[model samples]
Target chain A: MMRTPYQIVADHYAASDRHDPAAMMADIAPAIEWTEMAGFPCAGTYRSADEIVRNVFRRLGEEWDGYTFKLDALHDAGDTVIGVGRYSGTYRRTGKSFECRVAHVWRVDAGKIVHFEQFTDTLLVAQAMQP
Target chain B: MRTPYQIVADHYAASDRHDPAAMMADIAPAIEWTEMAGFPCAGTYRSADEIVRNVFRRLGEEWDGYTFKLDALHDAGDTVIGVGRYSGTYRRTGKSFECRVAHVWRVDAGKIVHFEQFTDTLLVAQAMQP
Candidate 1:
């Protein structure tokens, strides 16, 4: 079955919230070429499904208290999906509930995500990431 | 004459380099709401055209530097055009550049009214500023 870009977008966030590494890895590409903004004080790229899954689980276990994603917009092309959303969560260490505007660019080929790029409030993340 | 997104992209770069006030004024909307990254160490939104105009003039007068757009991607709709690219520069005192950048532009009603770009300016522009 062909997947709508919107559904792919939805599934990604849902799987993330569930802390389901298997389900998350099922959707992403095996070889993902990720380009990350450098020197912003955030983890840059995950590169592969394994690397991304490791980080996701690590964060789920160690970092996040709880989280929710509010999708605001969805734009589509032949194989590209752009999703704009708000991410709200509490930092496990700091115990602060915070939210920020964010956008995700996903490249899907054959119903699997080949690449994903996300942009959000780096400052907020930087502060939260630190103790 | 109708403008292709690519051509508009190029013209914006050229006018920026030339510091041509008239051409710059023509492409921008009278009221443009520009949302910029707030946390990073860089200039954020200046709001209306007037504020943007002042910043452009001031930078032109005081600094031998400016903003630039590199076309990495483009997608078009019936009335809206989107562009993605890398944008960077160096300070006059010391030279350095940074970031993988992209922008998605919303163009309509015969003007460029909204644009959002992402990049690493905290490290790049750390040494120099107004």
Candidate 2:
């Protein structure tokens, strides 16, 4: 009965770690509201997992070399899970690499991830994108 | 012994009230605070005076309708996390921005001694850009 919030969050991260997009989408609500940080390359709000995969995951691979989000700490706060992490990637166009701190606020309701927002240093990411 | 959660709660509520004095009441004397690098108040300040001068003072004089709407708070032992959104218009550019933000606060001996911020600086910059 309580395999909600925390359970769904853990499973999503497990899929993310494995780079398994299929599994990552399993627990996400169809009308998910995912907000990527405004300055992030994939900055925007997407309503579904498919949109996230196309707009974020695909763009990460298309523009960067070996981009990865490495979560260093995970806090279980009932319905909300806070993830503190770093993003590392090399922009293929500029051949510049960047590493920056990031935080994610994930909200789960009714056993499906309904909302998510990212916080990160977009300046660093932009610098990597520029020549 | 005050739970770190309560300390953060008080501070956040004070911030919401836009009462710098009340916020300062929760801050330790020798606190170290870091604003996100791309933010208008960007630096690591070591003293209350420095924070007031570099951060609060600037925010007071330079922005219009500035606010951090606290959506939630999480307790993680000595570390408290706040997630929210910021909305304000830079007086200089007269442009507005809304960005998601997170703050990591470390409390020690019933006082917050260290803090850090994470947020999308891009949106803030766009607000400032002509």
Candidate 3:
């Protein structure tokens, strides 16, 4: 049987905790539609794992000094899993870390992530944006 | 075609603006399941709007007046949209309301009716707690 919506969501944080590409990809489908919210270097739809790995993940290694996603709460309906949380990170170039709250709605199909959308407090990011 | 995510999100503001029940029901699901974060209220399943219609709605009317410096925003997607921040002053007993909040909503069939939110309740509660 497939994992429950709640478990699927917890694994996202777990995957991020390890920062392992394979672990992250394990939960997502091969043709996942990753639409990142603007305000970061990676903003737009990354069609496949390879593109995400090359354009997005690779940039993470270059830009953020380090980061952590703290999962504050989870809302699981039989159909969808919504995770509410926050992220704090050090900008690689500036070395300044800022915190912002976020909500992620994960659409799972057969226990794999098919679509994931995120919403966050981007004002702090506006302040952090390099001129 | 339905309204874009940006337009759909703005309706939530208008619905709340009027405090109209029909307007509220129109956007939410017929069998919607609602969950709220911990702080001042029931953090559980609100069936089809009945629970929300009563406990939640009544309290809004009961509040000492409140001012809304509603938001500072960010994020918009095909079926998802959101904005952040809230500052308000509660009218009753002269208590003030200052809150930091972020809401990410799902717009399926033009009803916001689905979404999740996060807030700085720790800060807000600490200040507002009686």
Candidate 4:
């Protein structure tokens, strides 16, 4: 059960906050299995930092005027880090914004995140997306 | 680092056996289990009893040989992830369904407080018809 500190995921989230795509890719295992919730934009399982950047981060950058995780709470549990927060962003087309609750489970191993999963209200996310 | 893998692992084992009682053994009465949308029973069920009634009970009744084939289990602190596939036959249509799935669980002190699932909905939906 040995894993990296919560700081690893913290750094990743920090990169996300800065809208730094390359930084977000930092500390992710090559074999990382990054999964976005079903029915959510960019939904599916991505196997690498490159895939996630291409599918999720890049798409968000292109579709949204500005996006943020707005993390409210961070829980530290050994190698598992839980980030509880809300997502807020304005869609480029509709110019309308949305807020939805989100929870992320990140599994760190050998100083790299090997696994990740996202859970959120897909319907709420869908409401303001590409409108 | 320490983890409660045994708790999560054992819970899945109980689930695999279709032992509802055993599955409820480590589930807190106030637990929240969110079944993914597009899947068979999709909703955020509050309370273990509520989920068992709406989720487990329905699955047990509506399908023949309904099973979750667990491929791997991993732990990160209080969160546990289960990666697997669902296999079963729709009772009404007699059609078989198999699709990959993932579950996220929040286990605290040997008791699970929350659980959530992710899966491709279309696969399960396609199985519902001829």
TM-scores, each model vs. reference: 0.71, 0.86, 0.54, 0.69
Cα deviation at A60, candidate 1, in Å, is 5.8
What overall lDDT goes with each candidate model?
Answer: 0.55, 0.86, 0.57, 0.77
Candidate No. with top lDDT: 2
Candidate 3 structure quality by residue, lDDT tens digits, A1-131: 46786687687768877887787777777868876655345666777877777877778677776666788767564446667777777777776777776677666788777876555544444334444
What is each model's TM-score for chain A? Answer: 0.77, 0.95, 0.86, 0.91
lDDT of 1 by residue, B26-96 (tens): 34544343343542323444344543455455545534444555544545441122334333344455544
Q: Note the residue pairs that clash in candidate 3.
A: B64-B92, B65-B91
Model 3: per-residue Cα lDDT over B3-89, one tens digit each: 545554565565457554543454554423333333344253335465456535644664544323344333334344344444443
List model 2 lDDT by residue over A3-116, tens digit each.
Answer: 958678778888987889999899888769999887888889999888999998889999999898898877777778888888899999999999888888888888889999
- Index of the highest-TM-score prediction: 2
The true-versus-predicted C-alpha distance at residue A127 of model 1, in Å, is 3.3
Q: In candidate 1, which residue pairs clash?
A: none
What is model 4's native contact fraction? 0.11
Write model 4 residue lDDT over A80-129, tens digit each, in one string. 77677777888888888877666677888888899887766555556675
Question: How displaced is residue A54 in candidate 2, in Å?
Answer: 1.7
The digit string of per-residue lDDT tens for model 1 on A1-131 reads: 48765577578767776766677667776777543445433356878876765664555456776666687766665567666667677788777766666666778777778777766555555556566
What's the lDDT of the predicted structure labeled candidate 1? 0.55
Instruction: Evaluate every candidate with DockQ and list the scores.
Output: 0.32, 0.64, 0.08, 0.16
Task: List the lowest-lDDT window of 10 residues for candidate 2 chain A.
Answer: A1-10
TM-score sort, best first: 2, 1, 4, 3
